Design a protein around this ligand. Structure first.
Ligand SMILES: Cc1nc(-c2ccccn2)nc(N2CCN(CCO)CC2)c1Cl
Ligand SMILES: [Co+2]
Ligand SMILES: [Co+2]
Ligand SMILES: [Co+2]
Ligand SMILES: [K+]
Length: 304
């Protein structure tokens, strides 16, 4: 394997972290290959769940808890902290909230959150590498509570970063918020990618194509598939009661990705930097409710 940039994995990984039996587990938690049979039973279906009030309460709770866990991770970002250490804090924070860390053993993913440094687009596996001053790093958190998953991510600065890093992260955040502003009943899922790419392109950035936003509720990833690039073939129209994510991955250079030998880590083929932000959204009548929003501060961590 020829690496695309300066990043390398730092092994060994500490042994898989257990989750006390008292915490309710998703179907895939105990599957030998971490396959989710409830998800697989809906593979290739484009029909979107309309959530009940019970479902909405469940989503509101789990998404609030997920935000709390992301905030825990935010507090730990500093030079010299390893991504495994962030993951350990995340793991314990989920457990403290009587939640299962959704990524853990999801299709055999070995950790409890994804840590995506610099050229890693998404699905970076927490390991022994200490964060370095100048790095940018995304932590993507998902929690499972009472049958419901809640999912968000933010990109962070490690110490002082360069102008390019600031522009990339700022622009990525803007793409997400411009797409969210457009969410309301009657809007086609395929429109969001038009908005996101318009803004990314205007700032000299490209939009990752291989990874998309997604339905989430009783399943971790489900209909609708939500591309972040222009002129996509996404199936569906937003309706009150739909829950899904928007999670644009944006790059300094080209949009092409490839995966490391670990089967997870997705990196820019050109080794330039990528950034991502993500919210879980509920479509209402005036627009939408940002379920994973901060409740106690106006802005994402990188501005604050
Ligand atoms: C966006 C996405 N993320 C993950 C993931 C996985 C591990 C940790 C964090 N995220 N998985 C996704 N999948 C994985 C397997 N799928 C079924 C095909 O085998 C599609 C949903 C998808 Cl579609
Ligand atoms: Co993912
Ligand atoms: Co996520
Ligand atoms: Co997501
Ligand atoms: K990154």
């Amino acid at each position: 394997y020829r690496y695309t940039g300066k990043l390398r994995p730092h092994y060994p990984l500490m042994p898989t972290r257990p989750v006390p039996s008292y915490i309710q587990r998703p179907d895939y938690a105990d599957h030998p290959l971490g396959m989710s049979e409830s998800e697989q039973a809906l593979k290739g279906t484009s029909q979107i769940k309309l959530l009940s009030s019970e479902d909405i309460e469940g989503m509101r709770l789990v998404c609030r808890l997920a935000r709390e866990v992301l905030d825990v991770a935010a507090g730990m970002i500093k030079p010299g902290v390893t991504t495994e250490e962030i993951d350990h804090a995340v793991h314990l924070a989920c457990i403290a909230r009587n939640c299962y860390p959704s990524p853990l053993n999801y299709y055999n993913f070995p950790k409890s959150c994804c840590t995506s440094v610099n050229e890693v687009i998404c699905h970076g596996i927490p390991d022994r590498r200490p964060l370095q001053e100048g790095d940018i790093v995304n932590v993507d958190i998902t929690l499972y509570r009472n049958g419901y998953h809640g999912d968000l991510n933010e990109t962070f600065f490690v110490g002082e970063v360069d102008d390019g890093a600031r522009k990339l992260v700022q622009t990525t955040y803007e793409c997400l918020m411009q797409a969210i502003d457009a969410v309301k009943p009657g809007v086609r899922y395929r429109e969001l990618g038009n908005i996101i790419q318009k803004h990314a392109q205007a700032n000299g950035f490209s939009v990752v194509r291989s990874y998309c936003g997604h339905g989430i509720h009783k399943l971790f990833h489900t209909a609708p598939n939500v591309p972040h690039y222009a002129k996509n073939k996404a199936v569906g129209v937003m309706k009150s009661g739909h829950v899904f994510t928007i999670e644009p991955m944006i790059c300094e250079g080209g949009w092409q990705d490839e995966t490391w030998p670990d089967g997870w880590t997705a990196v820019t083929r050109d080794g330039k930097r990528s950034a991502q932000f993500e919210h879980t959204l509920l479509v209402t009548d005036t627009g939408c409710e940002i379920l994973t929003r901060r409740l106690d501060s106006a802005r994402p961590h990188f501005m604050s």
